[PDB]
Amino acid sequence: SSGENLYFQGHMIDFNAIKNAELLVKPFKVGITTNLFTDPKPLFKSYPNSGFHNIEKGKQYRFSVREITTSDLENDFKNLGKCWQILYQEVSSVQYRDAILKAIDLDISGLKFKMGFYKYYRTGDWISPHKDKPEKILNHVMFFNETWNCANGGQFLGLRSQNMDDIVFEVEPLVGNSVFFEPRENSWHAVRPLLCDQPRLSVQIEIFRTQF
Numbered sequence: 001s002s003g004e005n006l007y008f009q010g011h012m013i014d015f016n017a018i019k020n021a022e023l024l025v026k027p028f029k030v031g032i033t034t035n036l037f038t039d040p041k042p043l044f045k046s047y048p049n050s051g052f053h054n055i056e057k058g059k060q061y062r063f064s065v066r067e068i069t070t071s072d073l074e075n076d077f078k079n080l081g082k083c084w085q086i087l088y089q090e091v092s093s094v095q096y097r098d099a100i101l102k103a104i105d106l107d108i109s110g111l112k113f114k115m116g117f118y119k120y121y122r123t124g125d126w127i128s129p130h131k132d133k134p135e136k137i138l139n140h141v142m143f144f145n146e147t148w149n150c151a152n153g154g155q156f157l158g159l160r161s162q163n164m165d166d167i168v169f170e171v172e173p174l175v176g177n178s179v180f181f182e183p184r185e186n187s188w189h190a191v192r193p194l195l196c197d198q199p200r201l202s203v204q205i206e207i208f209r210t211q212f
C-alpha cells in the first residue's frame with residue numbers, strides 16, 4: 001500500500017522528460033521522450049471523440065484531425081476535457097520554451113503555434129515519407145494510447161531517405177512517448193499504415209514564424 005502522504009506533481013508535463021530526452025544527431029537532430037506525462041492513465045479516455053474531419057491525399061496520407069481553434073480559446077475550452085486546456089497552457093508557457101532550449105539548443109520565444117488532435121483509426125490510415133514543410137520551425141508529436149499492439153502498424157518511422165523501407169528508428173504510439181524535431185532537408189519520417197481499425201491517438205504542436 002502507498003503511503004499516507006503527499007506526492008509531487010508540478011505540471012501535467014514532466015519537463016525533465018524533454019530536457020533529458022533521447023537525442024539523435026544522425027540521420028537528423030530529433031528528440032524522443034519517455035514518460036512525458038506525470039499522470040498518463042486518464043488521458044486516453046479524455047481524448048476527444050467528436051469534431052474531427054477526415055483528410056487524405058492519394059506526399060500521401062489518410063487520417064482525421066480536430067484542430068484547437070479560436071472558438072476553444074473564447075469559450076474557455078468548454079467542448080474539451082480540462083486536461084487539454086492545461087496542455088495548451090503548458091505548451092504556451094516559459095517552462096516549455098526553456099525545456100526545448102535545453103534539449104536541442106533552439107529558442108522558440110516569440111514564435112507562433114498550431115495545436116491539433118490527430119487520429120488514425122481505419123485500416124490503411126498512414127502518412128508517406130516526407131520531411132515537413134520548411135515553414136515549420138519545430139514539430140512535436142505526442143502520443144496518448146494506453147495500449148498498442150505493435151503488429152497493428154502505426155509506428156512513427158524515422159527514415160534515411162524518402163523510402164518506407166529505409167528505416168533508422170521507430171517509436172511506438174504509447175502515452176509518454178513523443179518526438180520533436182526541426183524540419184530540415186533530410187528530416188524524413190512516416191507512419192507505418194494501420195493493419196486494422198484501432199484508434200491511434202496523438203497531438204501535434206507545429207511551431208512557426210510564417211503562417212501556412
Ligand SMILES: O=C(O)CCC(=O)C(=O)O
Nearest residue numbers: 118127141156189191202
Ligand atoms: O503521427 C505521427 O506519428 C507523425 C505525423 C506527421 O509527420 C505529420 O502529420 O506531418
Ligand SMILES: [Fe+3]
Nearest residue numbers: 130131132189
Ligand atoms: Fe510530419
